């Protein structure tokens, strides 16, 4: 499906911080909260891909893009961050703040 791929791409392209999530997903909630803590709300989009008729197609495309089909799946300026554990590693080791600084998102 070119349609599914185009839709996912539009989400990743239009929004500097793009998070694909699902309903009642503790690590999605954790990842999103960490990102919102950097006041990134204005440049964040969260898509619940479980509430979508094409969830499997979306997860498969996310796996083609990132290596995993699980949510959360996180992109920053089209770069793959990965899941919540990846985000926590980057955050703890200073990499996340580095990304955000290069994007003018944090001073």
Query: What technique solved it?
Result: X-ray
- Establish whether 45 is an annotated binding residue: yes
- Establish whether 50 is an annotated binding residue: yes
Final resolution, Å = 1.7
- The domain that contains 82 carries what CATH number? 3.40.30.10
As a whole number of angstroms, the distance between CA 107 and CA 105 comes to 7
97 phi/psi in degrees, rounded to 5: -60, -40
Residue 68's SS3 state is coil
Q: Are strands 79-82 and 17-21 parallel, antiparallel or unpaired?
A: unpaired
- Establish whether 43 is an annotated binding residue: no
How many domains does the structure of the chain reveal? Answer: 1
Show the tokens assigned to 8.
């996912």
Residue 89 belongs to domain spanning: 1-107
Q: Which residues of 62-95 are buried (b: 16+ CB within 10 A; e: fewer)?
A: beebbeeebbbbbbbbeeebbbbebbeebbeeee
């Amino acid at each position: 499906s070119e349609a599914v791929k185009k839709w996912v791409n539009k989400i990743i392209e239009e929004n500097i911080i793009a998070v694909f999530a699902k309903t009642e997903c503790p690590y999605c909630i954790k990842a999103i909260s960490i990102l919102k803590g950097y006041n990134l709300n204005s440049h964040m989009h969260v898509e619940n891909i479980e509430k979508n008729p094409d969830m499997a197609n979306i997860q498969a495309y996310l796996k083609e893009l990132t290596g995993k089909s699980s949510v959360p799946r996180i992109f920053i300026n089209k770069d793959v961050v990965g899941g919540c554990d990846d985000l926590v590693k980057e955050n703890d080791e200073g990499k996340l703040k580095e990304r955000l600084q290069k994007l003018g998102l944090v001073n």
